[PDB]
Design an enzyme around this catalytic site. Structure first.
Site, PDB file in Angstrom:
ATOM      1  N   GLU A  71       0.996  -1.177  -0.015  1.00 33.55           N
ATOM      2  CA  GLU A  71      -0.103  -0.002   0.068  1.00 33.55           C
ATOM      3  C   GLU A  71       0.845   1.084  -0.102  1.00 33.55           C
ATOM      4  OE1 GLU A  71      -3.918   0.944   2.040  1.00 33.55           O
ATOM      5  OE2 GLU A  71      -2.680   0.561   3.721  1.00 33.55           O
ATOM      6  N   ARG A  79      -4.652  -3.825   0.539  1.00 30.89           N
ATOM      7  CA  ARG A  79      -5.835  -3.161   0.324  1.00 30.89           C
ATOM      8  C   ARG A  79      -6.253  -2.838  -0.992  1.00 30.89           C
ATOM      9  NH1 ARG A  79      -4.768   0.383   5.305  1.00 30.89           N
ATOM     10  NH2 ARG A  79      -6.244  -0.632   7.061  1.00 30.89           N
TER      11      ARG A  79
HETATM   12  C1  LIG Z   1      -3.183   5.311  10.740  1.00 35.74           C
HETATM   13  C2  LIG Z   1      -4.237   5.998  10.278  1.00 35.74           C
HETATM   14  C3  LIG Z   1      -3.934   7.279   9.431  1.00 35.74           C
HETATM   15  N1  LIG Z   1      -4.950   8.158   9.007  1.00 35.74           N
HETATM   16  C4  LIG Z   1      -5.727   7.911   7.874  1.00 35.74           C
HETATM   17  N2  LIG Z   1      -5.522   7.050   7.154  1.00 35.74           N
HETATM   18  C5  LIG Z   1      -6.505   6.950   5.942  1.00 35.74           C
HETATM   19  C6  LIG Z   1      -6.138   6.166   4.977  1.00 35.74           C
HETATM   20  N3  LIG Z   1      -6.563   6.513   3.768  1.00 35.74           N
HETATM   21  C7  LIG Z   1      -6.436   5.575   2.529  1.00 35.74           C
HETATM   22  N4  LIG Z   1      -7.312   5.775   1.399  1.00 35.74           N
HETATM   23  C8  LIG Z   1      -5.620   4.459   2.989  1.00 35.74           C
HETATM   24  C9  LIG Z   1      -5.052   4.300   4.001  1.00 35.74           C
HETATM   25  N5  LIG Z   1      -3.940   3.340   4.076  1.00 35.74           N
HETATM   26  N6  LIG Z   1      -5.125   5.180   5.089  1.00 35.74           N
HETATM   27  C10 LIG Z   1      -7.348   7.954   5.981  1.00 35.74           C
HETATM   28  S1  LIG Z   1      -7.098   8.690   7.487  1.00 35.74           S
HETATM   29  C11 LIG Z   1      -5.288   9.337   9.938  1.00 35.74           C
HETATM   30  C12 LIG Z   1      -6.264   9.351  10.727  1.00 35.74           C
HETATM   31  C13 LIG Z   1      -6.344  10.369  11.514  1.00 35.74           C
HETATM   32  C14 LIG Z   1      -7.738  10.469  12.311  1.00 35.74           C
HETATM   33  C15 LIG Z   1      -7.284  10.630  14.102  1.00 35.74           C
HETATM   34  C16 LIG Z   1      -8.298  10.752  14.900  1.00 35.74           C
HETATM   35  C17 LIG Z   1      -9.718  10.481  14.505  1.00 35.74           C
HETATM   36  S2  LIG Z   1     -10.948  10.451  15.565  1.00 35.74           S
HETATM   37  O1  LIG Z   1     -11.819   9.336  15.427  1.00 35.74           O
HETATM   38  O2  LIG Z   1     -10.467  10.319  16.953  1.00 35.74           O
HETATM   39  N7  LIG Z   1     -11.647  11.924  15.348  1.00 35.74           N
HETATM   40  C18 LIG Z   1     -10.947  13.242  15.547  1.00 35.74           C
HETATM   41  C19 LIG Z   1     -11.711  14.342  15.914  1.00 35.74           C
HETATM   42  N8  LIG Z   1     -12.665  14.295  14.888  1.00 35.74           N
HETATM   43  C20 LIG Z   1     -12.109  14.944  13.531  1.00 35.74           C
HETATM   44  C21 LIG Z   1     -13.524  13.329  14.625  1.00 35.74           C
HETATM   45  C22 LIG Z   1     -12.536  11.840  14.347  1.00 35.74           C
HETATM   46  N9  LIG Z   1     -10.086  10.118  13.111  1.00 35.74           N
HETATM   47  C23 LIG Z   1      -8.837  10.101  12.278  1.00 35.74           C
HETATM   48  C24 LIG Z   1      -5.626  11.484  11.335  1.00 35.74           C
HETATM   49  C25 LIG Z   1      -4.901  11.472  10.350  1.00 35.74           C
HETATM   50  C26 LIG Z   1      -4.642  10.491   9.550  1.00 35.74           C
HETATM   51  C27 LIG Z   1      -3.448  10.304   8.481  1.00 35.74           C
END
Ligand SMILES: CCCN(c1nc(-c2nc(N)cc(N)n2)cs1)c1cc(-c2ccc(S(=O)(=O)N3CCN(C)CC3)nc2)ccc1C
Ligand SMILES: CCCN(c1nc(-c2nc(N)cc(N)n2)cs1)c1cc(-c2ccc(S(=O)(=O)N3CCN(C)CC3)nc2)ccc1C
Ligand SMILES: O=c1ccn([C@@H]2O[C@H](COP(=O)(O)OP(=O)(O)O)[C@@H](O)[C@H]2O)c(=O)[nH]1
Ligand SMILES: O=c1ccn([C@@H]2O[C@H](COP(=O)(O)OP(=O)(O)O)[C@@H](O)[C@H]2O)c(=O)[nH]1
Ligand code: NA
Ligand code: NA
Lengths: 230, 230
Positions: free
Chosen positions: B35, B100
């Site tokens: 990925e 994926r």
């Molecule tokens: C290890 C995960 C990395 N990560 C993500 N990855 C991907 C992704 N997309 C692909 N197409 C392929 C692929 N492999 N990965 C999409 S987003 C990511 C996630 C969050 C993040 C943190 C906290 C919460 S929360 O639920 O605590 N909350 C916070 C408050 N408010 C906003 C509501 C939601 N959500 C997301 C932030 C940055 C990042 C890079």
């Protein structure tokens, strides 16, 4: 036989939509692909998205430039491919006139937005990578370009004639910058692009400072002579 | 002959990279497409762009979600197509394992970001339109899916084991939401997608709650039995 692909290029309000609408009526062998952004200026999903994106762009260009440029270019490729696959199957000398091209998307508009700091380096590098790839994954390569050359002042006056409220704020300085880019690309041929074949594509330059709506026969004669050389 | 395309799906830190690296070593007829996002977590233009985008995403997801999702999906399609065209030309029973798929990009990650208001309606509709189109303009359609099924708690523990500083803030609640989406798509098959063939694609579900790094022969046996059915 094989459809000739000709892009119509020029500054904002030079008269491309006007010229293309003249051309389409003159021959059953001639078809046009209007520019998606022009149509964003019953509504399809793309028109609804594009109207929202244009409106947000006027409000905050440094937030929306990357989203707008990617959607405009996607919409153009989709529309050009649909015409290339759809139209002119029973034509003797088929010609498809594109209102602008994926090259004006990148080398005029997106380039200008990067230069104005409306895209950061990461947004601009992602956009160029996407463009380099979105174009290779080919049948849209141009047989020729028609450059409708107008002064920035003519184009400023024609924005006033056209009367879209959103555009009346556009300043001469913006039109001068886009004019220089067109002159570098299509007149001096100083602009370096990532598409080698473009340095060699024939270009017909038409001076459109004089109003042509009721008097376009000389311009069309130059278009027919140009087509015969391709 | 014709390369079988199998996607490996599962929650964050379920053990996909681990499993794929096990599989690649077991057969000269087996290759893997890691990925792009995993590799963003000498540097290529894509790695530099992807590291910047991930960093900005952690800082302001409601600004960067659309840019990130579009680049991640483009990077994946490019990498999958390169392997499909590049590898396994002299294999007797060629299999390409995708870490994926373009479906997890849209229906797990981008969908979740839209649900969290990190993309607005226009960004989400442009993204879906782009995805619908970017996928048809075809050779990446899956012959099967392997679902590595782990509890959110197992995945939270494995984020801790893996130790990437950026991820230690990820809360169980985020993993539970992504878990429900995977269960809806791959176990209950309640998730409606815009890709009709997916309702009928075979799915092998593997429970990976127990550590498998030194004890993976039963999992690989189930993979070989599954492959023989395709
Ligand atoms: C290890 C995960 C990395 N990560 C993500 N990855 C991907 C992704 N997309 C692909 N197409 C392929 C692929 N492999 N990965 C999409 S987003 C990511 C996630 C969050 C993040 C943190 C906290 C919460 S929360 O639920 O605590 N909350 C916070 C408050 N408010 C906003 C509501 C939601 N959500 C997301 C932030 C940055 C990042 C890079
Ligand atoms: C009628 C032009 C519409 N317009 C644009 N169109 C395109 C476009 N892109 C295609 N790929 C295809 C295509 N057909 N069109 C790109 S942007 C547009 C332009 C401005 C805008 C206003 C003012 C100045 S400025 O020079 O006064 N200045 C301001 C201060 N600061 C930032 C520095 C720059 N620049 C741009 C704002 C919204 C919009 C939609
Ligand atoms: O010879 C001309 C060419 C154009 N126009 C007007 O100039 C404006 C802009 O032309 P167009 O929409 O064709 O410009 P584009 O942005 O498509 O180049 C419109 O109101 C046209 O009716 C004109 O009066 N005479
Ligand atoms: O059976 C396993 C599977 C995974 N891991 C560890 O769990 C973490 C996440 O695994 P991976 O990177 O393979 O997860 P992915 O995000 O690729 O699913 C890594 O530190 C692995 O070494 C483990 O200790 N035992
Ligand atoms: Na016609
Ligand atoms: Na192998």
């Amino acid at each position: 036989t094989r459809i000739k692909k000709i892009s119509i290029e020029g500054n904002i309000a030079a008269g491309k939509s006007t010229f293309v609408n003249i051309l389409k009526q003159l021959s059953e062998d001639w078809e046009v692909v209007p520019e998606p952004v022009a149509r964003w200026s019953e509504l399809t999903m793309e028109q609804k998205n594009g109207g929202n994106v244009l409106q947000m762009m006027y409000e905050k260009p440094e937030r929306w430039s990357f989203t707008f440029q990617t959607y405009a270019c996607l919409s153009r490729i989709r529309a050009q491919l649909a015409s290339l696959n759809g139209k002119l199957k029973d034509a003797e000398k088929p010609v498809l006139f594109f209102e602008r091209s994926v090259y004006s998307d990148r080398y005029i508009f997106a380039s200008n937005l990067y230069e104005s700091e409306s895209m950061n380096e990461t947004e601009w590098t992602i956009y160029q990578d996407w463009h380099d790839w979105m174009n290779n994954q080919q049948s849209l390569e141009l047989d020729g370009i028609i450059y409708l050359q107008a002064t920035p002042e003519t184009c400023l006056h024609r924005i006033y004639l056209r009367g879209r409220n959103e555009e009346q704020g556009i300043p001469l300085e913006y039109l001068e910058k886009l004019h220089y880019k067109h002159e570098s690309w299509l007149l001096h041929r100083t602009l370096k692009t990532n598409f080698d074949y473009l340095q060699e594509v024939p270009i017909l330059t038409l001076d459109v400072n004089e109003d042509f709506k009721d008097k376009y026969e000389s311009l069309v004669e130059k278009v027919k002579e140009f087509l015969s050389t391709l």
